[PDB]
Structures are given as structure tokens and as C-alpha cells.
Amino acid sequence: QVQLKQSGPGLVQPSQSLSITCTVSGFSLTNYGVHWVRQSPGKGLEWLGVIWSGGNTDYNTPFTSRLSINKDNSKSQVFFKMNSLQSNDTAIYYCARALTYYDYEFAYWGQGTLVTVSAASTKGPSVFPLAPSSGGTAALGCLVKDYFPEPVTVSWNSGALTSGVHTFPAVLQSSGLYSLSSVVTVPSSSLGTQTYICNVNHKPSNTKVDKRVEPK
Amino acid sequence: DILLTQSPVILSVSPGERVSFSCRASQSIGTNIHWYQQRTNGSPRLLIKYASESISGIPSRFSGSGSGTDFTLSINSVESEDIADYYCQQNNNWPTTFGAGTKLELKRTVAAPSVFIFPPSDEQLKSGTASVVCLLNNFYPREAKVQWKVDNALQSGNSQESVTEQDSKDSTYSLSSTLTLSKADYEKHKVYACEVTHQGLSSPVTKSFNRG
């Protein structure tokens, strides 16, 4: 199967550079170009450039002087590098592959890399339980609080629990640190026989925490 | 560069209805337009290439038409999982450019939220802060009011709300409201109440607890 997998989310300091690796499988880099597209609040979807089969590059006009794309065919890796980032470069960056070697209809995409441009320091989250205290249904959750930058991933029971899960968008606190809750509803009778663990991963700080949530 | 203008900005429709997205180009681009679907937290998914051409794995309800400057993506009978943002892309002229997108929202019947309240954990209290969380689960429409009271004092300015995107199956939202107090304030008071107002409730629903 054709896949593109990008390196993890990262904080970049203003005027510093951004580096992202796209590792592909299911096809050879010698046979297809790999494009880079970003998506920001201020600009939406914006094509940045491409590295062609033979190693040639084209860069979109505003990026010709600060964008560098290279690759390692044998390693199936494409390297995106952009210099002098400013806060309006905060965006999700994607690699993508077209349907054919020369074209631009992007049938396959990486999962995206969220880049935050900020002078602040990375900080791992605290995780606190939202303990189950109607209609045989109990709600419980985890409060993932005080981290920077975005994003965090939250799953339940190592991915086995997905039904009834709601992970809320993070909100920025006045501290300049993010906070979010993830909740799930389950039958109250299962509270005594099943375990509920929220698996939290804050990649920018390399922080993984599994919080068990139980009736108080 | 070619400017693509997508309209409307937001489309709200009921399941089973026909829907169409418009993309207008600043100059003629032939049929060199591709369409994408982007679900919440997802990457773009190619729906139609070259204005009207189908893509393998894409449901038959998606189709496209148009040439020149005026293009249309159609969903002939919308399903709940079609909830997403939709984008057009032109590639007649370098550089390839994208529209600003149309958000597709889905209508459904009114559904009252189920309300749950969570006291701060003892774990958190050790750090000197208390978070109290009120959950409004699986409701529609999106509009809701959450009012916090501590010992009958109305709380203002010290809570934040977050709302999920529409669920792909039942089209409902959920909402969290988080009331944040210093530990000292929290310890000074007893009754913590979340009062929820929503169209699907005949009267406000209050969930509360007594600290300890």
C-alpha cells in the first residue's frame, strides 16, 4: 500500500529553521515526485514545492530563497527544510504524492506535521482523572493540562476503546499553555470489571503517560 | 496566481438531500480542477480529478462538473459521514492553488445533552489548582449555555469551553466547560454547580457536588 509518513510535531523558534522528513513506502522515489503542501489559519492550503523523480526541484514563488528539498532514494526519504520561520509559518505541513509521476492530483498524503513557531519552551502535560461518579451510563475522562506546544494524542485502553470517546480541541490558557479533556461513556456496570486508561502522548516533549481512571 | 473562490463558506443540509459546492476561478482554467474532502483531524482526500473524472474508492454519490471558470462538486444524497471541509484545486497555471474551502454541516433533530460534572482530583489539588469540568454530551443544535455557580455565586470569566466537531454517525456535538479556581478558593467553598441551558431541555439541567 502507498503510504507517506512524516516526522513528529515540533516547536520552531522565530528566525530558526524547520526540518521534516517524509518516509515513503509502496513506491519508489525514483518513479514519483513528492510535493509539500501546508495548511495555516491565515493562508489555508498552499503548495510549497516538489522534488521530482530525477531530483530536480521547483519552489513556489514566496519560498524560492528559504526552502530546500532533498531526498535519499535508497532510504525512501524526502527532506523538507525551511529557513527563517516567522509566526505566520505556524501550520500543518504535508508531503503528498500525485496519481502519476508528472502530475499534481494529490491522491496520497502524509499525516501532516504541526509546526509551531514560538520563542517559548516545550512543556509536558499533567494528566488528571475525571472520575466516574445516568441510565446505566457512566462518563469518565482525563484532563490533560498545561502543555506546550500542540498537539497531544489521546487514545483509550491502548486503542481498544474508541466507541463513545470525545477528545475536545485544546484551549490556550492565559498561562500560554494548552489544556484539553478527553472523555468516554461506558456502561456503569463495567466500572467494576474493566480497566480504563487514557494513553497520552505529547511528542514535542517526549512525554507519555498512561492514566488509569477509577470511581472515587 | 489563479484565485479560486469557493461558495458558500458554510453549507448546512439534511441527510438524503442533494448538495453542491461552487468553485469559481479568477480566469479560465479549462477543466484543470481537482476536488478534495478533509475530515476533522484528517488529511485531504482526493474526490474528483479534472473537473468530472472519478477516483477509485470514492463513493458514486460524489461527482463534479463545469469548465472555464465555474465548477461544481455534487453529492447527490448526503450522508452523515460526509461532514467535512471541501476544497478545489486548479492546475492549469503554475503554481497550483487551492480554494479557501466550504464547510459542510449536517442538520438533524433536536437532541438534549446528557450532563455530567467532575470534581477536581486530589492529585491536581496538590499542585495548588482546581479544575472543575462539566460535560455536555451528544446534543444538537450546537448552541448551549453553561452557567457555573459556587455557593450560589455566579462565576464569570474563569471558565473555558471547547466543542467537538459534528459526530460522523449521529451528527451531534459534545461540549466541555472547565471552571478553574486556585486551591485556596476551592477549599473555601462547598457547593459546585453546573447549570446547562439547551433547546432540547424543557428547563435548565443542573449537576452539582459538595466538596467532600
Binding site: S40, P41, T90 | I10, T40, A100, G101, K103
Partner: peptide, 12 residues
């Protein structure tokens, strides 16, 4: 109306 990085969807 613009793309929101926390909700990962358009935010009108």
C-alpha cells in the same frame, strides 16, 4: 472563515 490548528477543521 479559516483553518483551525486545535480543532483541525475550518473555523468560521
Amino acid at each position: 472563515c479559516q483553518y483551525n490548528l486545535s480543532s483541525r477543521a475550518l473555523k468560521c
